[PDB]
């Protein structure tokens, strides 16, 4: 038989997904809201100083034009600012598919559902 069980929102209406980039990992909680984001309990502008990192986090929501329709509670650890910001980006994209599985094709086409494989390679 198959090993895939339909993903569904939890008891509090939250979609939980994990993402990885380089050495970083991110676990995000997406719920329907008004665009409030918290990264490790801190404001987005506090945790991520680079605007390009903030723009990466927003991109999946910008693809489905739902930037003001969800509250994101992102928790990230490991690597640096870029790995964490893009790991959160990847995790938000995977968590948005539960709210509307018809938008998976658009998320895949934008490239936010593809796990970036590049990592530091020991010189050979």
């Amino acid at each position: 038989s198959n090993n895939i069980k339909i993903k569904t929102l939890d008891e509090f209406g939250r979609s939980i997904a994990v993402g990885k980039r380089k050495s970083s990992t991110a676990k995000v909680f997406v719920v329907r809201g008004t665009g409030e984001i918290l990264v490790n309990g801190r404001q987005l502008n506090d945790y991520f100083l680079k605007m390009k990192d903030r723009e990466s986090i927003m991109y999946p929501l910008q693809v489905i034009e739902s930037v003001g329709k969800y509250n994101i509670f992102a928790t990230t650890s490991g690597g640096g600012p870029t790995g964490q910001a893009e790991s959160i980006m990847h995790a938000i994209a995977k968590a948005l598919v539960v709210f509307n599985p018809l938008l998976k094709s658009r998320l895949h086409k934008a490239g936010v559902l593809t796990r970036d494989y590049r990592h530091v390679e020991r010189k050979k």
Binding site: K52, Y59, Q62, V63, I64, L103, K109, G111
Partner: protein, 50 residues
């Protein structure tokens, strides 16, 4: 509603190319700051889109 909306562009190709040419040693943030500050000064003297 989304079927007829083009996927928004991840980045500007020209600005990204200019930024990487300015950048050295992987210090992209400094390169982006220099370009953004320069383009901010162009807007403040021409009052057009830099």
């Amino acid at each position: 509603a989304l079927k007829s909306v083009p996927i928004p562009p991840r980045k500007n190709a020209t600005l990204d190319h200019i930024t990487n040419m300015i950048m050295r040693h992987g210090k992209k943030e400094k390169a982006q700051t220099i370009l953004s500050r320069a383009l901010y000064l162009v807007y403040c003297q021409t009052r057009q889109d830099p």
